[PDB]
Design a binder for this molecule. Sequence first.
Ligand SMILES: CCCCCCCC/C=C/CCCCCCCC(=O)OC[C@H](O)CO
Ligand SMILES: CCCCCCCC/C=C\CCCCCCCC(=O)OC[C@H](O)CO
Ligand SMILES: NS(=O)(=O)c1cc2c(cc1Cl)N[C@H]([C@H]1C[C@H]3C=C[C@@H]1C3)NS2(=O)=O
Lengths: 175, 268, 111, 96, 85
Amino acid sequence: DRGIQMLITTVGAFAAFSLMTIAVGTDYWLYSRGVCRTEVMTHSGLWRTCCLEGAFRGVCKKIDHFPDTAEYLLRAVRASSVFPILSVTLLFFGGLCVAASEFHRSRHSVILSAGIFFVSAGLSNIIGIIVYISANASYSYGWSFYFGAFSFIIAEIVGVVAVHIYIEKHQQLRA
Amino acid sequence: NGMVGELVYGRADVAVAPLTITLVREEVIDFSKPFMSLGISIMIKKPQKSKPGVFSFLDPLAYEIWMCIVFAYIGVSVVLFLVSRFSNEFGIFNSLWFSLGAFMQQGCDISPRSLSGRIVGGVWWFFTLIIISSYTANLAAFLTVERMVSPIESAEDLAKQTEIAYGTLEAGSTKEFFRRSKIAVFEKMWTYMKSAEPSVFVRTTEEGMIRVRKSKGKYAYLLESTMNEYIEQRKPCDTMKVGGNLDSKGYGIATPKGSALRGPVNLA
Amino acid sequence: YLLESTMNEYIEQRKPCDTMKVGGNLDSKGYGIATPKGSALRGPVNLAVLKLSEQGVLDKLKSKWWYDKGECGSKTSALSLSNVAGVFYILIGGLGLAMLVALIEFCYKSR
Amino acid sequence: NQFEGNDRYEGYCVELAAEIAKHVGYSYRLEIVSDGKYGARDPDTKAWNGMVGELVYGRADVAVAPLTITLVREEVIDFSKPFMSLGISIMIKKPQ
Amino acid sequence: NEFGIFNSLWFSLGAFMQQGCDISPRSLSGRIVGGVWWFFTLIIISSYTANLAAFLTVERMVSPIESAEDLAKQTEIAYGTLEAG
Ligand SMILES: CCCCCCCC/C=C/CCCCCCCC(=O)OC[C@H](O)CO
Ligand SMILES: CCCCCCCC/C=C\CCCCCCCC(=O)OC[C@H](O)CO
Ligand SMILES: NS(=O)(=O)c1cc2c(cc1Cl)N[C@H]([C@H]1C[C@H]3C=C[C@@H]1C3)NS2(=O)=O
């Protein structure tokens, strides 16, 4: 089962990274009514708002994140998208460790660190979602949003499998 | 014809009916200042009170809270497993079971022994106390809450669909308003109404009221807001006014053009 | 302050939006276009106003100058995520802290 | 300062005066009332002031302000059909 | 399985948060402490959730005036009009 576990880990790590990178890049987080500015039905993301109806259909304008310390912090954290980006970064390093686990096998801790990166990536992702939704306060979420959500699920599955790999290693070599 | 005809031809000296002030009429009779305001409005048969759904127990919390609770549940469970393996036992399946029991206020066979396991457990217990308390506060109220939902709830909505037929009183101000309109929605409405067979129009307000009442929510009557409000209050009150007013106007006391009563009536 | 409802509404829609209309209207009336008694403009002005009213011009003007201004654009209800976000921040904070403590307790016991 | 004449002003009544002028077919200059008052008959002097005064005494031909239709004014000037509805209302400071 | 300081802290926390624990005191003095802490918990948590329910359902920010009559009856607030209007 070592092969299958590492396959799940590697494919999973790639899947999670891809989904999360697409999600951060693309602009189908939210379907609300609004204005792309040269109200109408729009599709927005982390960075841009874009129109789906009218003469300006496909025009896409940068979000003004800045139109109480708590409110300011929320606006800042939302504006930067630090948490979605940090999630992408940690998934990147997780996948890096997964790759490095094939070559330099001598140190077992590499695959564990992969695990910790993926688990942390998922926590960063949760915080991101909560900041996103909280800052937006009729609407609906689009496929970019759901890609972020599926990334969280896959990252947590891969974290669990990575940790299992390390456990199997430390339980094989001690005996 | 009618009251305006009588005023023009000299059969009467004043009209003190709910006669709408309109441009076409103003050119042949002299109106007073309006003594009552109104607008065109939609009357529909009152929909049945919708019973709350099979999944009404979800209603006290927004969908996004439910989604986040689920991610939090997974997060907590994975971190518990991790910290415990770094420190029966907290493998992933038991971590999932422990977290679920904590959330549901049940408890289970096992409790964390490490410091990091107890930190995770402690904050999840705190989270649970806040969220479950909030959820359970008003729960029975959400389970038993009836909300009537209007089929159309707008003029645009009435124009877009074709399942519900809508008519007017003919030889009335509303018919004339729709006929001579240049607004997209009302032009569309008129194009429909003119062609519709059998005639969507009626001869009397009572006729339109009965038509809405007996059409099982397949007829929407376009009438003046004053009559609409009056009717909606009368028994059996199985009609309801939907949306806002399509425009603003008023009833005026009419007199024949060049009448000697024009000024005194205005001042009265 | 006792003023006309139109002015009251317009004011309440603009910053510094610390004022508000209370209750209903004490009476019902309207603005008119005035002219000198015995003027020749009386009839045409009346007809012009009727034309403008029937053509939606007055409605559009009102909507433009009142609603679109919007300097400030501001019982079973579901809780919203914003109402409980703080509990989620504490939770994820706690998970972070737990992971940190676990790494320490490890490195300490590794040496 | 960059503009001069009737084009110095904006607002609901400005556009309404424009549209009325279009329909009726006349040219006009928007003169602001000097008193800065709407209109009232001083019970002692029996003099109309403000816009109503300006209309009655012949200095102005139309008034396109938010001028309320009242009985006392209808006795001395002609009003058209109302172009906007309203009522007396109470304005209070919003509590925090 | 014993009430050292860390398990004492864990026992108390679980009791308060309504979760229960691995362990329960067996001595008389341990049970006195546990029993009063259970009692304290029942009062305080019940008070929190009772009062929480109240905060989650209050929505009537009622204006002092709310009508003309209420403005006429009082005399603390002065009310005026525009001159020559
Ligand atoms: C061995 C035992 C292990 C112990 C495990 C610990 C977990 C228990 C619960 C933590 C509650 C979290 C604390 C919440 C504090 C929030 C304070 C705050 O935000 O204060 C705002 C202030 O009122 C300005 O407005
Ligand atoms: C079996 C092991 C033993 C466990 C034992 C611990 C349990 C203690 C529980 C509750 C104490 C609450 C008692 C509080 C009652 C005080 C008030 C009262 O009795 O009366 C007030 C006064 O007389 C008129 O004003
Ligand atoms: N929307 S509003 O309140 O500015 C408004 C108010 C009114 C309008 C038109 C509008 Cl857009 N027209 C009417 C006029 C049309 C005919 C009926 C009453 C007068 C003559 N006056 S009103 O009823 O005072």
